[PDB]
């Protein structure tokens, strides 16, 4: 995507919120931005916490959400304004309500502008609202999983990515990551015990996409073969892109 | 053997 060093960028900590909903998204010497999200069906609720790290009160504290044209048609975001005055040492909360319309790839950008000590401060950070947040885990017996896996005929609906692992292959962490990703983590479906099989329905207003995922660790090459088989080619592609960056 | 193909 964007070339150049990603430090002090709009996506420094973006990847950290694909499988978890709580934590600090951004922090400079004046402001700390924390998050707490909750999702259900094709909806979500993201609490954004703005902490004033100084002994001085912030003014004109202004957070705004920015979405590209395509993203607009696939994702709907709503939020109530927060008080523009933030006491030094104080923390203020903002709630963002989410509704997924259709599968999407782009991410919303949160822009924050405010005054401190009489100076204009500007921050832009990508908000971690990703397609997987709208997963309904679907537990199912092995037999049912394979029947569904073999119902795929359109080659474009299958997307495979073979990539190098970025983190250790710590089983419980990977399980937590997959569970955190959203789908159900089906136990004992793939005869290969090292493989992870997930099944879920990506819920969007306009279409429910049945998703089956197979994550095949390659311990030696420290790579994974991720296969997404879903009822929609673009969903297969995006879920593949996202999950790929997580291991 | 492998139910994935």
Swiss-Prot record, chain A:
Q: Where in the cell is it found?
A: Cell membrane; Membrane, Coated pit
Stretch of the intact protein here: 701 to 938 of 938
What mutagenesis or variant effect is reported for residue 229 to A?
Abolishes AMPH and BIN1 binding. Reduces EPS15, SNAP91 and auxilin binding
Which tissues express it?
Answer: Expressed in the brain (at protein level).
Quaternary structure, from the entry: Adaptor protein complex 2 (AP-2) is a heterotetramer composed of two large adaptins (alpha-type subunit AP2A1 or AP2A2 and beta-type subunit AP2B1), a medium adaptin (mu-type subunit AP2M1) and a small adaptin (sigma-type subunit AP2S1). Binds EPN1, EPS15, AMPH, SNAP91 and BIN1. Interacts with clathrin. Interacts with HIP1. Interacts with DGKD. Interacts with DENND1A, DENND1B and DENND1C. Interacts with FCHO1 and DAB2. Interacts with ATAT1; this interaction is required for efficient alpha-tubulin acetylation by ATAT1. Interacts with KIAA1107.
Print the organism lineage.
Answer: Eukaryota, Metazoa, Chordata, Craniata, Vertebrata
Q: What's the family? A: Belongs to the adaptor complexes large subunit family.
Task: Give the protein's function.
Answer: Component of the adaptor protein complex 2 (AP-2). Adaptor protein complexes function in protein transport via transport vesicles in different membrane traffic pathways. Adaptor protein complexes are vesicle coat components and appear to be involved in cargo selection and vesicle formation. AP-2 is involved in clathrin-dependent endocytosis in which cargo proteins are incorporated into vesicles surrounded by clathrin (clathrin-coated vesicles, CCVs) which are destined for fusion with the early endosome.
Q: Which domain of life is it from?
A: Eukaryota
Q: Which gene encodes it?
A: Ap2a2
Q: What is this protein called?
A: AP-2 complex subunit alpha-2
Q: Which organism is it from?
A: Mus musculus
Swiss-Prot record, chain B:
- PTM remark: Phosphorylated on serine upon DNA damage, probably by ATM or ATR. Not required for membrane translocation after EGF treatment or for targeting to coated pits, but essential for a subsequent step in EGFR endocytosis.
Compartments it resides in: Cytoplasm; Cell membrane; Membrane, Clathrin-coated pit
Tell me the superkingdom of the source.
Eukaryota
Q: Where are the sequence repeats?
A: 2-4
State its role. Answer: Involved in cell growth regulation. May be involved in the regulation of mitogenic signals and control of cell proliferation. Involved in the internalization of ligand-inducible receptors of the receptor tyrosine kinase (RTK) type, in particular EGFR. Plays a role in the assembly of clathrin-coated pits (CCPs). Acts as a clathrin adapter required for post-Golgi trafficking. Seems to be involved in CCPs maturation including invagination or budding.
The entry's free-text remark on domains says: The EH domain interacts with Asn-Pro-Phe (NPF) motifs of target proteins. The UIM (ubiquitin-interacting motif) repeats specifically bind 'Lys-33'-linked ubiquitin.
- Subunit organization: Interacts with HGS; the interaction bridges the interaction of STAM or STAM2 with EPS15. Isoform 2 interacts with HGS and AP2A2. Part of a complex at least composed of EPS15, HGS, and either STAM or STAM2. Binds AP2A2. Interacts with AP2B1; clathrin competes with EPS15. Binds STON2. Interacts (via its SH3-binding sites) with CRK. Interacts with SH3BP4/TTP. Interacts with ERBB2. Interacts (via UIM repeats) with CORO7 (when ubiquitinated at 'Lys-472'). Interacts with FCHO1. Interacts with FCHO2. Interacts with SGIP1. Interacts (via EH domains) with DAB2.
**This chain belongs to which protein, by name?**
Epidermal growth factor receptor substrate 15
Lineage of the native species? Eukaryota, Metazoa, Chordata, Craniata, Vertebrata
List the range of the whole protein covered here.
628 to 632 of 897
